[PDB]
Design a protein around this nucleic acid. Structure first.
Lengths: 50, 178, 50
DNA sequence: GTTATCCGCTCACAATGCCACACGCGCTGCTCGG
DNA sequence: CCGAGCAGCATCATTACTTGTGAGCGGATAAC
């Protein structure tokens, strides 16, 4: 009752979220620095780290 | 009358430019231009017309660091530490940095006057080294530079013509290695 | 007995104490310790029990 | 106060041998380069 | 222009239950 199993699904989404927080920081800073409204919501993210 | 001194903060390997940008941006963010005078990243422009890199080349006084005219206060401190990519305040103990001396500022600014005044091609030459010639008149010959000139820039170079060695006035543009 | 041992007795003093504790060699100020604490817990971003 | 005493805490330092097999081992915006 | 090489990077908090033992050190604790 104190030791839970953890399948491939939960672990996979966890690695997803972990790789996601870093691109979150990056896109936050790029939204901060760069022009607020001159862009399409299509490149401020970089999916390569994901 | 708060006199903003000059401090130095460690940048990263290849980040210095955007670091200075983001710094000015965050200054504008908190509107603290009164506390942050100027972010100085000294550089150098060595100019060679050929040899791979051509017509210019950009060096820096010293990498990894950025120079600021901040004023000392914890607010400004975190304002510089709440930026994307920097290390701590290069200096004495952390949370109590060491402003660089005024003599340092004066010397560095004399350095900047010197470098920005004359575009000085580095990777210079020394009297006594041997070197070939990639130019039509003396293709792939090789002699020794007996005198180096900068303004005239014409490489007094002793080379073997008609038996007896003799000086030649070929320009930098045709020198080989070294 | 613990309160006898307790070095500080003031709230902001407590925050600067824990601020030094978690990460020494850094400027103990009010806002910095407060941010460190209320983002060590109470932060849906940097924390989630489950 | 001194003076040494001991103690809590910190940090270093050890983890069977083989095998076999498998898998994998820079990057990332600067640099250069034409 | 745009592909191929490249130069020094904690790449914030990146955390991290013990393993068991020994030695040493900063500081509490007591004798003179």
């Amino acid at each position: 009752g104190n030791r839970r199993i953890r399948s491939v699904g939960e672990m996979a989404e966890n690695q997803f979220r972990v790789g996601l927080v870093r691109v979150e920081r990056a896109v936050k800073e790029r939204l901060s620095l760069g022009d607020l409204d001159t862009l399409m919501p299509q490149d401020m993210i970089n999916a390569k780290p994901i | 009358a708060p006199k903003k001194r000059w401090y130095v903060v460690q940048a990263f390997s290849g980040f210095e430019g955007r670091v200075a940008t983001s710094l000015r941006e965050h200054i504008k963010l908190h509107n603290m231009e009164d506390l942050f005078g100027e972010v100085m990243v000294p550089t150098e422009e060595v100019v060679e017309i050929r040899g791979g890199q051509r017509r210019k080349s950009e060096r820096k006084f010293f990498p990894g660091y950025v120079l600021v005219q901040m004023v000392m206060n914890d607010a400004s401190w975190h304002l510089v530490r709440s930026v994307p990519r920097v290390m701590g305040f290069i200096g004495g103990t952390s949370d109590r940095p060491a402003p660089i001396s005024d003599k340092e500022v004066d010397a560095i600014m004399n350095r900047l006057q010197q470098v920005g005044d004359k575009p000085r091609p580095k990777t210079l030459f020394e009297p006594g080294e041997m070197v070939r010639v990639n130019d039509g008149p003396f293709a792939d010959f090789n002699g020794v530079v007996e005198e180096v000139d900068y303004e005239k820039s014409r490489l007094k170079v002793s080379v073997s013509i008609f038996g007896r060695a003799t000086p030649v006035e070929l320009d930098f543009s045709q020198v080989e290695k070294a | 007995e613990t309160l006898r041992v307790d070095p500080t007795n003031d709230r902001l003093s407590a925050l600067v104490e824990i601020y030094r504790m978690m990460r020494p060699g850094e400027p103990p100020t009010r806002e910095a310790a407060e941010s460190l604490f209320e983002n060590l817990f109470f932060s849906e971003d940097r924390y989630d029990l489950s």
